[PDB]
């Protein structure tokens, strides 16, 4: 064993000799160390699943809200400090209604996402030019998924750093490095919602190294027609039962 250490570790909002901002490079590793969360996009809807991880029969699951509505057409899933994202969501719900008021239309998923990033982009304790009023990078990553009529169904990864990518299917949290390399294998431009409802489970089964039920998984989706609904425990189960069978195929 042995110890590697740079002299510019630690440094808060100051550049390493490379141009790296280690305070924020680390902000980004702690997504890899929270609850699992997975999003997949079809041409027939978008699916978001997470890991519940109930720690008792008492604690009635469902106070475990790791997937929440934003407007009827935009949902997001979160991995990490669920408590630290209360404010991040308030701002997104507030921005989406505010847009609906000022303009009489549902707000573009691309721009709803960018607005949330523009919020965690106010990290600091000393800014001249424009003021960024807050204290620390926002300690939570987001999968934001919804539908507008310009650019079909969409999936987005909002990072604490204030930037984002639009993945066609993404995984974040404890299993991500592995779940991600599995989605990268099993995703095609022609999935059906039924097919992806299930692939999200198969990949939660894998990177949880366990057998799963409605006490440890929550499924949700967002269709053009029905909006953004979160599957109640019954539906999540005969979706699970439906995999126990599909994989007993060969």
């Amino acid at each position: 064993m042995f110890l590697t250490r740079s002299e510019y570790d630690r440094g808060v909002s100051t550049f390493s000799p490379e141009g790296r901002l280690f305070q924020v490079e680390y902000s980004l590793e702690a997504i890899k160390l929270g609850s699992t969360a997975i999003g997949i996009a079809t041409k027939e809807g978008v699916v978001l699943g997470v890991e519940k991880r109930a720690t008792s029969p008492l604690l009635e699951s469902d106070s475990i809200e790791k997937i929440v509505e934003i407007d009827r057409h935009i949902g997001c899933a979160m991995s990490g400090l669920t408590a630290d994202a209360r404010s991040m969501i308030e701002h997104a719900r507030t921005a989406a209604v505010t847009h609906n008021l000022y303009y009489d239309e549902d707000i573009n998923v691309e721009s709803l996402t960018q607005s949330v990033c523009d919020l965690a982009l106010r990290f600091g304790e000393g800014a001249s030019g424009e003021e960024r009023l807050m204290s620390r990078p926002f300690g939570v990553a987001l999968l934001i998924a919804g539908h507008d009529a310009d650019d079909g169904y969409q999936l987005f990864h909002a990072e604490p750093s204030g930037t984002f990518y639009r993945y066609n299917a993404k995984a974040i949290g404890s299993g991500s490095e592995g779940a991600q390399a599995e989605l990268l294998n099993e995703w095609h431009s022609s999935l059906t919602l039924k097919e992806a409802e299930l692939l999200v489970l198969k990949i939660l089964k894998q990177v949880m190294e366990e057998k799963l039920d409605e006490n440890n998984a929550q499924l949700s989706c967002i269709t053009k027609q029905d909006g953004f609904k979160i599957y109640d425990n019954e539906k999540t189960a005969e979706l699970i039962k439906e995999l126990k069978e599909k994989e007993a195929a060969e």
């Binding site: 604690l59 106070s63 408590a83 204290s135």
Partner: protein, 227 residues
């Protein structure tokens, strides 16, 4: 930034606090060392704190820290009735309390609270019991029953193996029957150690006294020895 976990420690060390849902009623329970001989008995028996006419709240932690919460809440409880004419819902009172302990970390850089709290009661009109728990982080959870505090783990273990959802303590009387047993495990003398409050549908909150608490302990340890 780690100071959160440290505060969560003070939780541990403090007056032990419990709570228990029922078929249609709810109960809390908690406190500390009888009386140091010479202390005034009749002027701080403020174990569980009334928030509205239908909502109560106990805590494990720094007693001097709770008060700042039991107020900011007792207030938003009115400032909701006032700007929306509608008593606060037990989830909302809870989400507001927890949401405050949360904002006592991530801005300005100030210290977080040395309390976990339990929050019980019935929403307005609706007669479905509600029980929640908060902690210095900003996390709120709903429980069929729970405890937080000192030797709280002994109790959470007891309860898990004594409560079942299939059949919740329906009787008003018997729902307390249980909450007592579960603190006798961790106390340090008995009835003289921890007391209880009881809220039933529609703003009917009736806290229990010393004499009703010993028509219980001394009707428990009767059935006990019978082997």
């Amino acid at each position: 930034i780690f100071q959160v976990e440290y505060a969560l420690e003070a939780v541990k060390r403090g007056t032990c606090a419990v709570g228990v849902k029922g078929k249609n009623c709810v109960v809390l329970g908690c406190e500390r060392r009888s009386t140091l001989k010479l202390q005034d008995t009749r002027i701080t028996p403020s174990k569980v704190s009334k928030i509205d006419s239908h909502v109560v709240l106990s805590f494990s932690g720094l007693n001097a820290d709770s008060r700042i919460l039991i107020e900011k809440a007792r207030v938003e409880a009115q400032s909701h009735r006032l700007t929306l004419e509608d008593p606060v819902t037990v989830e909302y009172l809870t989400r507001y309390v927890a949401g405050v302990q949360q904002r006592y970390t991530q801005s300005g850089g100030v210290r977080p609270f040395g309390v976990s709290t339990l929050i019980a009661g019935f929403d307005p009109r609706d007669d479905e019991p509600k029980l929640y728990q908060t902690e210095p982080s900003g996390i709120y959870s709903s429980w069929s029953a729970q405890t937080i505090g000192r030797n709280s783990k002994t109790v959470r273990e007891f309860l898990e193996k004594n409560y079942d959802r299939k059949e919740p303590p329906a009787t008003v009387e018997e729902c307390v029957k249980l909450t007592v047993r579960s603190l006798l495990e961790v106390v340090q003398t008995g009835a003289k150690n921890i007391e209880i409050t009881v809220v039933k549908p529609d703003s009917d909150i009736v806290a229990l006294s010393s004499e009703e608490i010993n028509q219980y302990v001394t009707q428990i340890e009767q059935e006990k020895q019978e082997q």
